[PDB]
Amino acid sequence: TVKVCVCGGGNGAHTLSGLAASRDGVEVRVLTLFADEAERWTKALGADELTVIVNEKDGTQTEVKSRPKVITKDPEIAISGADVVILTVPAFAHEGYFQAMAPYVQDSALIVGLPSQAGFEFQCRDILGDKAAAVSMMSFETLPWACRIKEFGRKVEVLGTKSVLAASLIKGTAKTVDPLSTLQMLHGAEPVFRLAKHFLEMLIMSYSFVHPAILFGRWGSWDGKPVPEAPLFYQGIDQATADMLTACSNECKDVANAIMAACPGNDLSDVKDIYQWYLEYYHEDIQDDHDLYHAITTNKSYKGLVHPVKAVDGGVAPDFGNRYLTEDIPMGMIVFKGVAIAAGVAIPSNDKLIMWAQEKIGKEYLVDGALTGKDVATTRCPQRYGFNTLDAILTGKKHHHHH
Numbered sequence: 001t002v003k004v005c006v007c008g009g010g011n012g013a014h015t016l017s018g019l020a021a022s023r024d025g026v027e028v029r030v031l032t033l034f035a036d037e038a039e040r041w042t043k044a045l046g047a048d049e050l051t052v053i054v055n056e057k058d059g060t061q062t063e064v065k066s067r068p069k070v071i072t073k074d075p076e077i078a079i080s081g082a083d084v085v086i087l088t089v090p091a092f093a094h095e096g097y098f099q100a101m102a103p104y105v106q107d108s109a110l111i112v113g114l115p116s117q118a119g120f121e122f123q124c125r126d127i128l129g130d131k132a133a134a135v136s137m138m139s140f141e142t143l144p145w146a147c148r149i150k151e152f153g154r155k156v157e158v159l160g161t162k163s164v165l166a167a168s169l170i171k172g173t174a175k176t177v178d179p180l181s182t183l184q185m186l187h188g189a190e191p192v193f194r195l196a197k198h199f200l201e202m203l204i205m206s207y208s209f210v211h212p213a214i215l216f217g218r219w220g221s222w223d224g225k226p227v228p229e230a231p232l233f234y235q236g237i238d239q240a241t242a243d244m245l246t247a248c249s250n251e252c253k254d255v256a257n258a259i260m261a262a263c264p265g266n267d268l269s270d271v272k273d274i275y276q277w278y279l280e281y282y283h284e285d286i287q288d289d290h291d292l293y294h295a296i297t298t299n300k301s302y303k304g305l306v307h308p309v310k311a312v313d314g315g316v317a318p319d320f321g322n323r324y325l326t327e328d329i330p331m332g333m334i335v336f337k338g339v340a341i342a343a344g345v346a347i348p349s350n351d352k353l354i355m356w357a358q359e360k361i362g363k364e365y366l367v368d369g370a371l372t373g374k375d376v377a378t379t380r381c382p383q384r385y386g387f388n389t390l391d392a393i394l395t396g397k398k399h400h401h402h403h
């Protein structure tokens, strides 16, 4: 019997729990720490089965029904004896789960982020301590499905599923269950999983600069006058915004080349141009592909998507404060900046977007080119935990002097 613990209670947690518990020879436990969310789930389900509805390529639908072993808020019941532990939640909630699992997790456990976002490995090392050198750490690029809850604790719907997906791995001293084949078994036929070359490859290929750049391109020098309706979002960019994206992508390459030269034996060669990425994955949907401006604006998958807005005098105005900036900056752009400082590489285009975005949400992280901001302790940069060198970033070990 393979024992699995799922952490969370949203769209992603509903889908994963239902599919995994339907497999022969698997036992599933659910843990959530958001007030009394676990008691609410148990009461709504009762004696019935959980249902997952899957939309197929034909136009037909398939139903899956199962029942988990236990749903609780107690970490002693959920974590003890588990072979795999998987986190599927927004990034600001990760700190709480690492603290709760610490006294109960076994040496041979496999810890997975689905999705991890940026700074996942640094945080795990700080909280678990010496134990972090025994276990293994696995990080995925994004969520496997597009999904939404229909009825709390009872029903969830899958709108689509990716064809392929990739993940990185750091191995410890203890022997675990095989990472690639075990994860494939839980999900089914699709998506087909593969392994990436390095964990720092996965970190920077996040392209954290994308959404902040699109918002800056349209509202950067706004005078304060309203518009008739909500304008297009990806398909509404200008040539100047396209040149901004190219410059930020070039800076990602400069950082990767500097690490390989200073620390031989670390393979970061699969880090690529953003223009190369678009043509490899979106080829069937693009009408005209001769440059980056035409590749984005003529993409069929971006049809009809608009900016977030709100009602004002004589029209509409941009609505800030959702999650485009509150997650992508402290859990993304700021982490990349910390790595660049340690390598000694300047990044002027990335710096400009950071200073503008932090002011719009009322926070402070970067001051005069240094990480000394008022809210610096709420980020995931390596310097926050005391990892100040490239050797410390790679291994997790700190240097000591001798008299």
Ligand SMILES: NC(=O)c1ccc[n+]([C@@H]2O[C@H](COP(=O)([O-])OP(=O)(O)OC[C@H]3O[C@@H](n4cnc5c(N)ncnc54)[C@H](O)[C@@H]3O)[C@@H](O)[C@H]2O)c1
Pocket (backbone or CB within 6 Å): 008, 009, 010, 011, 012, 013, 032, 033, 034, 037, 088, 089, 090, 091, 093, 114, 115, 142, 143, 145, 146, 147, 148
């Ligand atoms: N759902 C999708 O179609 C989709 C697609 C691609 C990527 N993603 C990404 O995957 C991640 C997870 O997606 P999701 O839709 O499952 O998230 P979600 O919004 O549905 O998750 C909500 C859950 O998070 C926890 N939570 C929320 N606020 C909390 C707080 N104040 N304190 C403590 N816990 C709190 C609760 O347990 C809650 O049930 C997100 O980062 C999202 O951007 C989602």
